[PDB]
Design a protein around this ligand. Structure first.
Ligand SMILES: Cc1ccc(S[C@@H]2O[C@H](CO)[C@H](O)[C@H](n3cc(-c4ccccc4F)nn3)[C@H]2O)cc1
Length: 138
C-alpha cells in the first residue's frame, strides 16, 4: 500500500477533462479523510469526509487562502463506510471539481482558485489504507 499522507504531484496543475482516481479502504473506526488540491500553500479544494462530527457523518469542502479557511460547503450524503473499499474520482470540469464515489455522483465544488495550472499537488490524508492514486485525461 501507499504511505499516508501521500503526495501526488499534478504536473502543470489541473485542467478540464483531467480525472484523478483514488482507491483505498477506510480503516475500522475511521474519524476523517482529506483530499487537498493545493496551489503552493493554498488549498484550492479540500474534500473532508468527517465520520463523527457531533455523531453525524458529513462531507466538508472548503478552500484555504493565505492560511485562512473560507466558507464551508457541506454534503450530508455520505457514501463512505468504515472498513470498506472505496473509489473517489475527481473530474476537473471548467467551473468545478466533480466528485463521484464508488461510481455515483456525490458533489461539485465551484473553482474558487482560478489558476488551475498552479494547482499542482494532491495530498491524500487520514484514516485509510491507500491502494492507488493516479490521473488520466478523458
Ligand atoms: C475558524 C476555524 C476553526 C476550526 C476549523 S476546523 C478545520 O476545517 C477545515 C474545513 O473548513 C479543514 O477540515 C481543517 N483540516 C482538517 C485536516 C485534516 C488533516 C489530516 C487528515 C484529515 C483532515 F481532515 N486538516 N485541516 C479543520 O481543521 C476551521 C476554521
Amino acid at each position: 500500500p501507499l504511505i499516508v499522507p501521500y503526495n501526488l504531484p499534478l504536473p502543470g496543475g489541473v485542467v478540464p477533462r483531467m480525472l484523478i482516481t483514488i482507491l483505498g479502504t477506510v480503516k475500522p473506526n475511521a474519524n476523517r479523510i482529506a483530499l487537498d488540491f493545493q496551489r503552493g500553500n493554498d488549498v484550492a479544494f479540500h474534500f473532508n469526509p468527517r465520520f463523527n462530527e457531533n455523531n453525524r457523518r458529513v462531507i466538508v469542502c472548503n478552500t484555504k487562502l493565505d492560511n485562512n479557511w473560507g466558507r464551508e460547503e457541506r454534503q450530508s450524503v455520505f457514501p463512505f463506510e468504515s472498513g470498506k473499499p472505496f473509489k473517489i474520482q475527481v473530474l476537473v470540469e471548467p467551473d468545478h471539481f466533480k466528485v463521484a464515489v464508488n461510481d455515483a455522483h456525490l458533489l461539485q465544488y465551484n473553482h474558487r482558485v482560478k489558476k488551475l495550472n498552479e494547482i499542482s499537488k494532491l495530498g491524500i490524508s487520514g484514516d485509510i489504507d491507500l491502494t492507488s492514486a493516479s490521473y488520466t485525461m478523458i
